[PDB]
Amino acid sequence: AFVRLTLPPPKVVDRWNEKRALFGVYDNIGILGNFEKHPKELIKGPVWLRGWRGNELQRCVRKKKFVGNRMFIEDLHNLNKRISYLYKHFNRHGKYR
């Protein structure tokens, strides 16, 4: 194989930037705040998987439910095919029955 003939540039991480310093604050907003807000409400992400977890087939179906009607034609077609592939895998294949 081949390896670099020079050392790559040093990578410097500032561990006291604002994002890292205050990471985690308000994770106990509920228990310490009279349960006004559940901590799951603080997650920033796709609408269909805020405060939710599942396997890919479940993830595929959940993406369709929330934004199935606002998706592009090609993206929706690929999602439908992705669901049908996963369905036959998880429900008809695998070592265990």
Binding site: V3, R4, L5, T6, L7, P8, K11
Partner: protein, 87 residues
Amino acid sequence: VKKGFRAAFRFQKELERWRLLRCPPPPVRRSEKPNWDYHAEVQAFGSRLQETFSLDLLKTAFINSCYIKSEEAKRQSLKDNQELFEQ
């Protein structure tokens, strides 16, 4: 262009061996190299042989006429071992 700094580092040392071994540098006295104190090493020399030595006398033995002349010239720009050699 793969990730990481470590793979380059291991190879940089591989480059080190290639250059040094193919074109070795001229020998350098152990004094110039790190981890050298004259007095401590002199003490160990006597202990290693198991023979008690007079440290001051042993120091003069290692001194040579050539070394003195070079030092004096550098200073411009401490007794020899000749008597010990004869005895």
